[PDB]
Amino acid sequence: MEFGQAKAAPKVQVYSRHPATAGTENILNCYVEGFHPPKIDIALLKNGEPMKDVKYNDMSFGDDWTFQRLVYAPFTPTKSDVYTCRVDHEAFTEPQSFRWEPDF
Amino acid sequence: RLIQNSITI
Amino acid sequence: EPHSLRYFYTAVSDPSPGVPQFVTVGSVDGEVFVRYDSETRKMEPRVDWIVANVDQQYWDRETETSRGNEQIFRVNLDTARERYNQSRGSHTWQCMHGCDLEDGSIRGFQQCGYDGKDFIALDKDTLTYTAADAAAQITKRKWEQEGTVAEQWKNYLENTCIEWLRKYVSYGKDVLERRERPKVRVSGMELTLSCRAHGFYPPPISISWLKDGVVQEQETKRGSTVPNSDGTYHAWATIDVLPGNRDKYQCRVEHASLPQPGLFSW
């Protein structure tokens, strides 16, 4: 971060391991990068509910000191279920939700 | 492997 | 074909969920292979190839080094707070070091940051430290006056680091030198065309949109290349077009697993 900058907002992508086929097992990914400080809440949600067996990879950081983390969970997407990654960080005024776009 | 014998600022 | 070894060190004054007081992460070619924190208090493997190729003494030594670093980083946080005349609060101390092996030549670096801003960095060519501000100038004088710090770092980065990188690349060759083909899908809404590439390795990739064979650089929006959980990668490119022009467009995907660039239509 630049001198006199306090914090940096997360940039977020939500994507599946494989192209989405409704009814086929897949993995849901939420990758969050470019944030500081490292304190963050990253939540994978199915219809607003916390998903089973979410895993959180170790954090890395770039030359600008900002952090990155992959968060993922196994899932079986359908035509009707709504999958989001909700991210709360002090550089957001309120938690931000990022919707997975299936593109079946 | 990690460098050993690090120093405080 | 190029290779790198990186160590990422993060200490905080106020830990939080997923953020221990002190973490060290090691990575080879951008893949995490070892990790230590102040809670487990041991260096632990994060990939199969490391455990299968080092002895117990490796783990014991990395653990011992990390246990000592934890203490050093606690002091750095206190000292930094005092240097900047700060009250008790949430603060971050980070250091990163590493080496690159590329086409006969080597690169090395060591840099530390406070609250996400530069603090001090090694200038390996002159064996001096580059201070970001007046607070860091005190550290510059201390490290330079010590008289062996810069030298030890040069030795480490130019010899030890590179020697171990060569070993790690050899241990993880089946993983690190493999190629996996992107599975590609094209989509569309309203018209925004989307070209998504799934599960490729290595990370370098080029996804372009073509109108009647013509590259549309100024029109192509791209995400950052991001990892999947299994160490493969994901990338996408989109383009905004007129809904009547749909069939003029193709997505070109260049990647090391593809002898020829792949072409895809919606």
Side-chain angles (χ1 to χ4, degrees), chain A residues 1-2 5 13 15-20 29 31 33 36 39 58 60-62 65 67 69 101 103-104, chain C residues 8 10 16 18 35 46 94 96 111 113 115-118 185 187 196 198 224 226-228 230 232 236:
Chain A
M1 301 195 300
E2 303 157 49
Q5 185 192 344
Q13 294 191 71
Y15 52 98
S16 55
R17 172 60 185 77
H18 307 286
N29 298 310
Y31 191 79
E33 64 181 308
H36 208 285
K39 177 178 179 175
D58 306 313
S60 197
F61 57 83
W65 305 110
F67 296 92
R69 191 194 283 273
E101 293 295 329
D103 291 26
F104 290 112
Chain C
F8 304 91
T10 306
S16 56
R35 176 212 163 84
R46 304 293 286 151
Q94 292 161 267
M96 193 194 325
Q111 60 202 43
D115 287 336
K117 272 81 70 190
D118 293 353
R185 180 176 290 176
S187 302
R196 252 173 249 180
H198 299 256
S224 125
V226 283
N228 297 119
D230 59 6
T232 65
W236 58 266

Side-chain angles (χ1 to χ4, degrees), chain C residues 95-265:
Chain C
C95 297
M96 193 194 325
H97 67 254
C99 53
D100 296 336
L101 222 166
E102 191 170 359
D103 198 39
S105 58
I106 64 168
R107 266 164 288 150
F109 69 93
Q110 173 218 355
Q111 60 202 43
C112 301
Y114 182 55
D115 287 336
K117 272 81 70 190
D118 293 353
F119 184 81
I120 208 157
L122 175 71
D123 180 0
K124 193 155 70 58
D125 294 343
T126 65
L127 294 167
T128 63
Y129 284 91
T130 308
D133 54 7
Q137 285 163 30
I138 297 162
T139 304
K140 174 185 172 60
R141 288 190 290 271
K142 174 185 168 171
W143 288 4
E144 287 176 6
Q145 285 162 203
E146 199 273 1
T148 70
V149 180
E151 189 82 46
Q152 281 176 95
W153 272 98
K154 198 198 219 299
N155 181 55
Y156 172 80
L157 295 166
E158 295 179 3
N159 303 295
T160 313
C161 188
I162 293 289
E163 286 153 0
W164 283 97
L165 179 54
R166 287 186 197 268
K167 286 188 193 162
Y168 298 149
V169 166
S170 183
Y171 303 156
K173 62 160 74 62
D174 290 356
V175 185
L176 298 163
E177 284 183 37
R178 84 192 190 279
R179 297 178 184 185
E180 287 196 47
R181 282 186 62 185
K183 315 296 161 161
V184 179
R185 180 176 290 176
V186 179
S187 302
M189 285 185 286
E190 271 197 284
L191 175 69
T192 299
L193 290 165
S194 168
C195 184
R196 252 173 249 180
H198 299 256
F200 60 93
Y201 192 90
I205 199 168
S206 187
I207 304 170
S208 302
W209 277 107
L210 314 188
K211 195 197 186 204
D212 293 318
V214 184
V215 182
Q216 310 297 116
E217 264 314 306
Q218 302 128 114
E219 322 310 314
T220 303
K221 198 156 73 73
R222 281 179 196 87
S224 125
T225 298
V226 283
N228 297 119
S229 60
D230 59 6
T232 65
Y233 290 87
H234 182 94
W236 58 266
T238 65
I239 191 165
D240 292 338
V241 309
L242 280 160
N245 296 326
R246 24 183 269 98
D247 279 352
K248 279 185 270 289
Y249 291 87
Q250 286 172 318
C251 174
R252 191 185 72 213
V253 174
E254 303 162 67
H255 184 79
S257 67
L258 302 177
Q260 322 301 335
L263 293 162
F264 304 88
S265 303

Side-chain angles (χ1 to χ4, degrees), chain A residues 57-75:
Chain A
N57 281 354
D58 306 313
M59 283 201 299
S60 197
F61 57 83
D63 302 286
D64 72 352
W65 305 110
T66 59
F67 296 92
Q68 43 213 286
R69 191 194 283 273
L70 176 63
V71 176
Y72 71 95
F75 85 136

